Every structure is written in structure tokens, then in C-alpha cells.
Design an enzyme around this catalytic site. Structure first.
Site: not given
Ligand SMILES: *O[C]([C]([O])[C]([O])[C]1[O@@]23[C](OP([O])([O])=O)C2456[C]O[O@]42O154OP326=O4)C(*)(*)(*)([C@@](*)(*)[O@](*)(*)P(*)(*)(*)(=O)(O*)O*)=[O@](*)(*)*
Ligand SMILES: *O[C]([C]([O])[C]([O])[C]1[O@@]23[C](OP([O])([O])=O)C2456[C]O[O@]42O154OP326=O4)C(*)(*)(*)([C@@](*)(*)[O@](*)(*)P(*)(*)(*)(=O)(O*)O*)=[O@](*)(*)*
Ligand SMILES: O=C(COP(=O)(O)O)[C@@H](O)[C@H](O)[C@H](O)COP(=O)(O)O
Ligand SMILES: O=C(COP(=O)(O)O)[C@@H](O)[C@H](O)[C@H](O)COP(=O)(O)O
Lengths: 363, 363, 363, 363
Positions: C33, C42, C146, C187, C189, C229, C271-273, C300, C303, C363
Site C-alpha cells: 500500500d 523506492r 489498514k 496498527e 506504530e 499490526k 517490518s519498520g524498515g 504484514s 520492504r 528514514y
Molecule cells: O514498517 C511498517 C509501517 O508501519 C507502515 O505499514 C508503512 O507505512 C508509512 O510510510 P512512510 O513513508 O510515511 O513512513 C506508511 C503509512 O502511511 O503508511 O505505511 O502503512 P504505510 O504505507 C510496514 C511497511 O513499511 P516498511 O519500511 O517496513 O516496508 O510494514
């Protein structure tokens, strides 16, 4: 929900009659509720022993002063012990106070208890059996109670846990008092300890006061039959930035007018370890502040009313008169401050060839 | 905030060790904490006088039963008085219990207090001096406490005021116990009084339980070192609609799995004035319910464990054995129910030419 | 309150079926998404212009893989744009996904909005007309949604205003989704930005999740027909302290079992980067954690499921194969990890080699 | 928390000036923000087609009155449509209003949305993109906004979810308005629908307002730069019990002084479909109420300020005069009422004659 009223019109009537009587005409409250320990610290400063007899002897001198004090003092908070003591003629103190038309109150809290998982923050104990105690106190001539909550300003303080607990406990105590005919004095004190500035204190005071009044509404507390006893907004004790009475006054009324409902009949500031002079100047300034003030802005002082009296005593009945006079002066002065009529150093404009004087050189 | 932990790893360790030990292997709790008054009502039904000696005599018989009970009972809740009593040989009851490997608990609340402006709703007293008392109890061999909150279902009940007060007081008590090494048993009981149906009870139970666990999180209570003692979901006593153990079981686990965290080691149901048979069948059904059950589902019964024992006693030491046997049977039976292994009427399928019997006609 | 059910037995059933269907058998979710602005970041790295076609092309390659992916992925979250796109043969993407037996989802939040008087904290927008939007999405074949809420750890963060706002906004969205037949993925986060350690993250996550689930209860959200999530508990990106999958797993499952009810079918970690490798390892470890886990612990991933496929594509249509194989590769090992059946042949700490996500530039 | 101010000293000043400017000297607000759907109901009764022109024509007649109305009306709330319309000479309506020294306002909410699991309770929409909308409105000459929240009294109403939701949504809007320079008019309306009496309304109104102001505090809303538009405390439309202006005034001022801070500049009552006469009488009485009133008690009337003008117009352009005079007539007596300087020559109870709003047919 509206079908289960907390109080009857008669209960409401008596509560408002008392709350108003205490703060009528600009009168304040003498907070003479220092516990044995606290009173010990006071007596220690004048080289006097902390014994029930010496405590009684001092309180006796204050309560037996000229009946004129009923013009400045409308109520007096007593520590349990003193509520049953007598003067040197067998007269019960509470009856002496009442003959002059002074309302008698009693400290109801039992100190603080640690809140786990916080940075040294507390809550207050005293709810257990508070009802029976209030009914009893009521029979013994008490018309109002006083509960002190402590909030600190520090790293992670005050926390929301600390704020919500102290507010709801204060609201509990309030409800219980009203059910037994006692006017509750709600004292949410934000302590001066710290190096924080004026602005930081004003912010915290509003937050605490908003939480307090919300809790009181949830608990169905009758505002018209209550009194608030908050701290004045001031910087912390260890703060380098010095502020004037006008600055403190502004911050205070600003915080108060944004949180305390107009239904509340009177706000009596605690002296919070302030010098006798400051406690008077600030209160005076508070009553001169141009902001909206729908309620009485009075005092509920302890050491700001006794500091010099204790000093004139020295433990000698031989110095009775001086003790009574020091107290009288402070009471008259603060009553003027509660009316915004406290002229500081005398009352004469520039002159020197005004008319017929005597005030000049020195001595 | 995370820099001010409520407990140390060692404090957490001891709490979890106790909480788990109480509910290990399918063991339950004997709630023998009936106060003098309540015990008076019990004794009255068997024409016995309510005196400290008769109370002691009954409790003595229960605690001195065959050591085999340590297979069914993992803990016992005592009323203050009993914690210091002895058997007919000078042995302290608490030490008798401990020699068998049974954990001793103590009732910590001091009853309810009226909440003004509600429809006959209460809160609970007991926080004042709870810390000192817990530390003391700790020295005297107690390892867990029990606090009972009461919520009612009626017109305007339970109110949010009632729910928030009882939840936070329960959370206060919990925190205080953990600080003194006692595992708190959180008992938020929604009483059966009323004509309300199953569905109405399940709704209210979830609401109360959600408020309870939120409060415990706010107060930083260590879930792994606690126990929950809630009511089973059932219709009210005056309800015409009759439900089966399976229906009650479903409603219960449904309400519980949507509110009680898996971090909680055990849930012990209160008998709530249920007959000995129902308390066993329902608990059994509760352990047969297909829903997610991450925690032990045990019992913490009072009269569902003593009803028949009290009846076999009659105030005569002459009937000791029968009393011990009635108690033993109920404990074994409920331990089976806590494992979902309680087969009701015997254990034989259809037959009559099965093999070599004896079970037929009558007598 | 029990006479006004939010959902009917029928509506509940469907919500229960969809949620369970998605996480069944170890299957996870593909988070594709990315908004055009996020997608453009990307494609930029692989030197491909951010045009609607390039976005469509790549997403076409992923959606047209062998039918086997239905053994790894149970759901795909789409961005509005993609929900109405077609492959190179005029066939709707959502229909391709459906024929493979994959459930289609849609991103419903509309970005953050600043909360004044906080330290750069925000709340999320997207409630306006969400009901109509959900009804239409349901008609177009979408079964779940989501909503991402962002909470940060910093000076005065996350405040209680930030926590109450996001939790309650998250609950409104959830109630609305369910009223239209879609399973809401909640979610909350806690972003990894900052130099905080593992324990600080764990503390905040437990706090946030407790508020979230109390909020869902207040709003009458059917937990059985929802999915969670949350972030994994890890140190901040700028944290020097090294943590293994076992530690990250312990902290995570600990936070979850104290807050998330067993009523919730599954927890699909974002996954949070973090590297594809780490997302797999941490996931495997979490399922191998010896704590109580009444819910499915899946993924879920965005990246972490697409990094290699993207890099192998390079924008060239001729790289369709290498792109598909790379994707299926990550989809299968993550499905293994979701069962704790993942084995990594290779040993290291913080030092060396993972030249393939050595370490991102955050980031 | 004190180091992240929502507003700067400059921003605060402007908000303070606008709010005070509107209610200064007894002046009130004209609520002409009827939506096309709501406007079509008014025109239908006078046999005029609901077209954009007819709506413009009428609103032109009102806005083009003698400059004197600036002594009665300090602000006008507009509906989006009207904010960009012009009179018969190509001059913008807002510019006409501005030259008369009247402050222009705009309706910002986008209607209600149902809350599932409640008894037909709703929350309000309009937060999405509100900031940009406010910035644009400010550039187009609008200085204040209006957000209406609806709370009803009925079986299970208003619930706490309904109260928390509307209060908090109302607070978000307010914070956003202030960040863009507009003074938010907070309107928490307890609708008159139902058969409830005066005391039930008073109870609910105090409850709603307490939540509202606690919410505004949490969101850091600057009370000095806000305005309140609450309902008056009256019995429900289907209530048979008769109440005089004095009683309605007492119940109202009582609810207000217990909940609304003195920091709020003014309280502009909404008319709620009550007769022009009643809106004036009740208003006069409220200002004559002997309770503490630290805020201006004015009006923000819709029908009660336009009923006669509309009826006199009839859709005919030739009736411009009778329409203007009728409007100015209501504008002046309501300004008198806002000062408690209104005198009605005429005595009655419930019986007879007010053949001119004998009594509406509600809804
Ligand atoms: O890590 C995770 C997170 O929590 C989410 O899901 C993502 O996201 C963001 O983007 P920026 O550029 O602002 O930081 C967003 C929101 O608004 O919204 O998102 O849901 P989205 O499409 C996951 C993915 O991410 P990575 O780094 O791991 O592949 O799972
Ligand atoms: O009353 C009042 C009210 O509150 C208001 O303001 C009105 O309104 C409504 O409409 P409906 O038809 O829906 O009911 C509305 C809203 O949405 O919104 O309004 O604001 P608005 O436009 C006043 C007015 O009304 P009356 O009846 O009185 O005229 O003020
Ligand atoms: O300022 C105060 C009263 O006057 P002071 O004598 O302290 O200046 C208040 O803050 C309290 O009464 C006092 O210091 C605390 O003692 P407590 O009553 O809780 O046992
Ligand atoms: O069901 C219960 C225990 O078993 P029972 O003996 O009542 O069936 C619980 O509800 C309580 O222990 C009891 O009845 C109330 O008495 P308390 O402890 O507050 O003074």
C-alpha cells in the site's frame, strides 16, 4: 442518573451557609492544624519543648485574643488533639471560638502513601472510617474539613497517575464530608520545592486544577458548599529568577480563572512556607489583578499568621499580650489584603511640608 | 517513566513463584475467610452458637484433614482471627497448612462504603495502613491477599463512577501488596442479585473486567504475580430463563478471553452462593469450552466447598471424620472440574451385559 | 447498554471468518500500500521514473506469480490506485488476487495531522465519509482495511493526549469498518526513530497497546473480527546497544501477552524498515518464545518482502523471473518464520556480513 | 509539557480581540448558516422554491440593512455558499458585512455519523483537511467558526462514549481553528427532543459541559479566545410541565456557573426552535439571574432572529422593507435582552395568546 441526588435541599442549604460564612466580609482562615510532630519543629525554633501542655498553651493564647478577631478570621482549622482541649479556666477551645462567631474546622487526612512505579510521588490516606469520624466531629462542633494532596514538579512529575489519584481521593473525601454536614476544603497543593520557574508552575497548577474539578463533577460534589485552598503560582524555591507580587498575582488569577468554577464561594491560599510579608503582598496583588474574579480570594495561613507570634511568646505566659498582638496585626493586615486594601508602608504620599507631621528623621 | 520500575527482578520472581504455585496441577483455593458475622450465619443454619471457639473448632477440622489435600488445594484464604489460632495441640493453623505445602492468604478489604449520588452503589475501604499490615502479614506467613469489590446490575447500575472507583481501588490494593511480597487476588464481583438474563451479565462483566485491567496497567501492577477471582457469567437469581452449564461456560470464557491478559497465571471463580453441584459442573464446562484459554481456570470456593461439611459437623467433634470426608470429596471433585475431567454420574456407558457389575436395581 | 448491539450474529460470523482466513496456516500479509510519494522513493533508488505505469508494472509482476504463493500469503493490502488497475491483458489486479484465493485489503488512513501543544506529535485523518468509502470498497471486492497511527518516543513523547487521540481515532475507524463488513487491521506504530533502548520501547509499547484495547472496548469493537499490526520491540535506530532475535522476541511477546486479548485472531508484525533478514529472524524467534501465545504471530511486511524483487527488477521487463523468484523466496521463509520452522545457516553478531542490508541509512 | 506552547503571545492576542469584539456591548450573533437542505424547509413554508437565488436574495435583504444593526449584531455565521455570493450590484456579501463592522464566521462541521452500539447516538464529521480549510477561510475574511455537536436525552442517552467523543472532537476542531487564527465557537447541544423535565436537562447539561471543558484543557485550547453556544436548560418539547423564564433562567445559569470557566468571554445561546418571543424573554431573564455571571450572556439565534423577516418577505422583492424592519426589530430587543434591559408589556401563562408561535409543530 438525576433521580438519585447526592444531597437534599436542606443539606445543600447548610453547606452553602457555612462556606459563605467562613469567607464573608473578607475574613480568612487560621490554619492551626500542625500535628504534634510539625508543632514540635515550630516550638524547637524558640527553644521550647514539644509537649501537649506547651502546644495547648500557645493555641490558648491565640484563641483567647480580643473578640475583635471575628472581623478578620471566619474559621480556624484544628488538629484533633486541640478540638478537645481547654483554656486555663476549663472552657473548651471550640466553644470559645464559637462564642465569637468563628467556624471550627478539622484536618481529615492522614498523610501520604507512596505510589509505586513513579518518581517519589504520593497519594493520601484517610478515607477508611471517614464517614463515622465526620459525623462524630459534627456532633463535637466542627463544621468543615481539610484534606491536603501533594503534587510535585520534577522529572516525570507530576505524572498522570499522581494527578488522577489525588484528584479522585480529594473528590471522595469531599463527597463524604458533605454527606455528614461538613464543608470540604479541597487542598490540591503543588509544592514549591525545585528550581522551576513561574511559567512552569502556572502550567502544572492549571492541569491539576482542571483534573480536580472534573473529578468533583464525576463524584457529584456540590461546589457551592466547598472551598478551594490552592497554592499561589510562584517559581520554585531554588529558582534564581525573582518575581514581583504583581507577576505572581497575574499568573495565579490566570490559572484560577481558567479552571475554578464560579459556583465555588471562596478560594483561600495556603502560605506554603512564605514569609509573613510576602503572603500579604501577593494576596493583596491577587485582589488588585484586573482579571475576572467571580469568587472571594482570601487566605488560609499557618506560619504566615503565627511566625512572629511564636517569636513573641518564647514559652512564657509572661509574654502573652505580645503574642496576641503579633497575631492580631497579621490577621488585620491579611484581611485588608483579601480586600485589596493593604497599603504597604503606611499611607502617605510625597510631602515634607504637607501639614503637621512628626514622621521624619528617625529617633 | 521506564526509569522508575515498580518492582525489582527479585520482587517479580517471588510474586510469580507464588501465583503459579497456588494454581499448579489444577489445584484451587479454599476461601475460608468468612468474618465473625458471616460465620455466624453459617453456624446458625446448623443450630450452633457463633463463638470464637466454635468457629475455631470447625476450621480446625478442615485444616487437619489428610495431607492428601495438598493435591487439590494450593491455597487457603483466612480471616484475620484464624491466622493466629491453633489446633487442639497448640500447633498454629498457618504452620499446619504450610507443612503440607499449602499457601496461606488473608482477606485485606474492610467492606464497602456508599457512593453518594448513585443508586445504592459502593466502593471498598481498607487502603489506610495496608502497607504496614501487609508487611506484618508477610512476617506471619501470609503469601497472598484478597480484596473484594462489588458491582451491581440494576437501574443505572453499574455506573461509570462505581466502575472507575472499584477498579482503581482494586489496582491500589494490588500495587501495595506486590510492594510487600503478597500476590494480590483481584476480585471484581458482579453480584447475581436481580432478574437480568445471561446476556446482560456477560456484557457488564466484560465492561468491568476491561476497566479493571486498564487500571492495573495505569497503576503499574505486575500481572504475572496476580490472580483474578471473577464471577462466572450467569443470569440473575430472580431470572426465569434457565441455562445449562455449557451455555454459562461459553458466556464466561467469551467474556474472559476478550478482557483478561494471558500474562495472568490463573483465574479462580468465586462460588457466588452456588450449590456445590453447580459450582463443579460449570467449572468443568468452563474447561471443556473450545475457546482460547491461555490461563488456568480454577476455583476459589467458600460454601461450594463447605456446605456439606458444615452439615456433617453439627457442632460435634464426634462427627469429625464425616466433616473431613465431605470437604475432601468436594476438593477432589472440583480439582477434576478444573481439569475438565469431572465425569458427573459415575463413569460407565450404556450396558447391562457389559461384564461383571453389581450396579443395578437399587438396594 | 446491552440492548443496542453494534453487530448482528451474521455480521460477526463474516468478520470472524475473514480474519482467521488471512492468518491461517502460517500465512501472512503483503503490505504493498505504498502511496505514490512513498513508492517514488523506492523506484528512484533503482533509477526508474515514478509513473503510474512503472508502479503498475512492478505490482503486476508480484501479483502474477505462481498459484503457490497462496500457501504463504493470505492477504494483500492495496493502495487505492492499484485497486482499479489491470495487468497487461485487461484483467483486474484484485480479480487475479481473488482467483489465487488471496484476500484483498485497502489502506484507509489519510496521513497525519499535528497536535498543537505537543512535541511534534500527530493524530491521523480519514474518518470523514469513511463509512461510504468502506461500503464501496466492499462492493469492489475488498475484505479488510489498514489504519496506521504513529507514536514516537522522545522528549515528552508519547504524551497522554497523543495516546488517547490515536487510540480513540483507531477505535472509530475499527467500528466503522466492521459496520460495513471489513476486518480492520489496527496498527499502533511506535516508530524506531531515536536513541532509546529495548526496555524504553517495551515500556511505551505496553502502554500504547493497553490504551488501544481499552479504547476498542469503549467503542464496542468486535475483537474476534480484527487483526493487530504492532511494531516489534527493538532499540531505536540510533541505539548502539546490540540485541539478538531472542532478546527482541522476549521483549515483544512480553509486551503482547500483558496487553493483547486472546480474542484477537492474529498479530501481523510490521517490518519498520529493518532488513529482510532481520524481519525473518526476529519473526522466527517470536514464535519460538516460551511465553503464552494465544494468537497467531505472523507478518504484514512491506520492504522486507519486496526489497530483493525490486532490486532484481531494475525497471526492465526482461527481469520478470528474477523478480518473481526473489519475492516468492521472501514469502516462503517468512511463512516458515511464522511457524518457528525457519533455520538460518550462518553465525554472526554485529560485525560482519550481511553485506545485503549491511545497514540502511534509516528514514 | 510547558516548553511546547500551542499558540504564541501574538496569536493569543488576536484570538482574544476577536472573541471580545463579537459579544461586546450586548451584541449577539446572527446564525444564518442554514444548509441548502435546511434552508429549503424554511422557504417551502412560504411557498418559495429552494434555489440558490432565493437563498441569496433573502440573505441579501438581511445583510443590506441600515448600518445601525452593528449596535445589535457583532457577528454573522455563514454557510459556505453565502461566503462567496454577491448582492444585486456585484459586491461580496462578506465585504458588506465587514464595512458595517460585523465579524464574519463560518460553519465548519459536516454533519453527524452514527456510533454503533449506542441508542441512535452520533458524533460529528469535519476534521479532515480542516486546517487548510481554516487557512483559506481566514484569507477570505472569516474570523470565527461554528461546530455543532448533538447529544440527546433518551433511554441510555447520553452515554459516556457519546460524551467523550463529541467533547474530544469538539476540542480537536477548536485547537485547529486557533492554529489558523479563527475563534472557535464550541456548541455542545443537548437537543430538546423528548418528554424529559427541566431537572433532567440541567443534570445532563452540567455533565456535558464539564466533559467539554476538561477536553478543551487536555487539548490545550486557549479559552480566552473561544466562545460557547450551549442550549438553554428547558424541559423537553414533549414535556407537559410549564416553566417560566425565571425558572428556565435559574436552571441555566446554575448549570453554567458550575461548569464554564470565567476565562470564556461569552456564552451565546442557541434558540433551538423556540419562539422569537421565548428566545428574548428567556435571554432577558438569564441576565437578570442573581447568580455569579463572569461571562457575557448573549445570543446566536437562527429562526428566532429570522422568522418574522421570512414571513414578511414571502419571496416578493417588493417586501424588502417589511423584511428588514422585522429583522432589525428582533435584533434590537434581543440586544436589550442580552443586557437584561428588555421589558415585555403583556401577561400570560400557558393558555393564551401568542397566536404568533402559539406553538410550533416541533422538529
Ligand atoms: O514498517 C511498517 C509501517 O508501519 C507502515 O505499514 C508503512 O507505512 C508509512 O510510510 P512512510 O513513508 O510515511 O513512513 C506508511 C503509512 O502511511 O503508511 O505505511 O502503512 P504505510 O504505507 C510496514 C511497511 O513499511 P516498511 O519500511 O517496513 O516496508 O510494514
Ligand atoms: O437551535 C440552534 C441549533 O443548535 C443549531 O445552531 C442549528 O443547526 C441544525 O440544523 P438541523 O435542521 O440539522 O436541526 C444545524 C446544524 O447542523 O447545524 O444548525 O448549526 P445548524 O445550522 C440554532 C439554530 O437553529 P434554530 O431552530 O433555533 O433556528 O441557533
Ligand atoms: O502552607 C501550608 C500551611 O501553612 P504553613 O504553616 O505550612 O506555612 C500547607 O502547605 C500545609 O498545611 C503544611 O505546610 C503541610 O503540613 P500538613 O497540614 O499536611 O500536616
Ligand atoms: O462467592 C463468594 C465466596 O464464596 P461463598 O461462600 O459466598 O459462596 C464471594 O462472593 C464472597 O467471599 C462472599 O460471598 C462475600 O463475603 P465477604 O468475603 O466480602 O466478606
Amino acid at each position: 442518573a438525576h433521580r438519585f441526588p447526592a444531597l437534599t435541599p436542606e443539606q445543600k442549604k447548610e453547606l452553602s451557609d457555612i462556606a459563605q460564612r467562613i469567607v464573608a466580609n473578607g475574613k480568612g482562615i487560621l490554619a492551626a492544624d500542625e500535628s504534634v510532630g510539625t508543632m514540635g519543629n515550630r516550638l524547637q525554633r524558640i527553644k521550647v519543648e514539644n509537649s501537649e501542655e506547651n502546644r495547648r498553651q500557645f493555641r490558648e493564647i491565640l484563641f483567647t485574643v480580643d473578640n475583635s478577631i471575628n472581623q478578620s478570621i471566619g474559621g480556624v482549622i484544628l488538629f484533633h488533639e486541640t478540638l478537645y482541649q481547654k483554656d486555663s479556666q476549663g472552657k473548651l477551645f471550640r466553644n470559645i471560638l464559637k462564642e465569637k462567631g468563628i467556624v471550627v474546622g478539622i484536618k481529615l487526612d492522614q498523610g501520604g502513601a507512596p505510589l509505586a512505579g513513579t518518581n517519589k510521588e504520593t497519594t493520601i490516606q484517610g478515607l477508611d472510617g471517614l464517614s463515622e469520624r465526620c459525623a462524630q466531629y459534627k456532633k463535637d462542633g466542627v463544621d468543615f474539613g481539610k484534606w491536603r494532596a501533594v503534587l510535585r514538579i520534577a522529572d516525570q512529575c507530576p505524572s498522570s497517575l499522581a494527578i488522577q489519584e489525588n484528584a479522585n481521593t480529594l473528590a471522595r473525601y469531599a463527597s463524604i464530608c458533605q454527606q455528614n454536614g461538613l464543608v470540604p476544603i479541597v487542598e490540591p497543593e503543588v509544592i514549591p520545592d525545585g528550581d522551576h520557574d513561574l511559567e512552569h508552575c502556572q502550567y502544572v497548577t492549571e492541569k491539576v486544577l482542571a483534573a480536580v474539578y472534573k473529578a468533583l463533577n464525576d463524584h457529584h460534589v456540590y461546589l457551592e458548599g466547598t472551598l478551594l485552598k490552592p497554592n499561589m503560582v510562584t517559581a520554585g524555591h531554588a529558582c534564581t529568577k525573582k518575581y514581583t507580587p504583581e507577576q505572581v498575582a497575574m499568573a495565579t488569577v490566570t490559572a484560577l480563572h481558567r479552571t475554578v468554577p464560579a459556583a465555588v464561594p471562596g478560594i483561600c491560599f495556603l502560605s506554603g512556607g512564605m514569609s509573613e510579608e510576602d503572603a500579604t503582598l501577593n494576596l493583596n496583588a491577587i485582589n488588585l489583578c484586573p482579571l475576572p474574579k467571580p469568587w472571594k480570594l482570601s487566605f488560609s495561613y499557618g506560619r504566615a499568621l503565627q511566625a512572629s507570634a511564636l517569636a513573641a511568646w518564647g514559652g512564657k505566659a509572661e509574654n502573652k499580650k505580645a503574642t496576641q498582638e503579633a497575631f492580631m496585626k497579621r490577621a488585620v493586615v491579611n484581611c485588608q489584603a483579601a480586600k485589596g486594601q493593604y497599603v504597604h508602608t503606611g499611607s502617605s504620599g510625597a510631602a515634607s511640608t504637607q501639614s503637621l507631621f512628626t514622621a521624619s528623621y528617625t529617633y
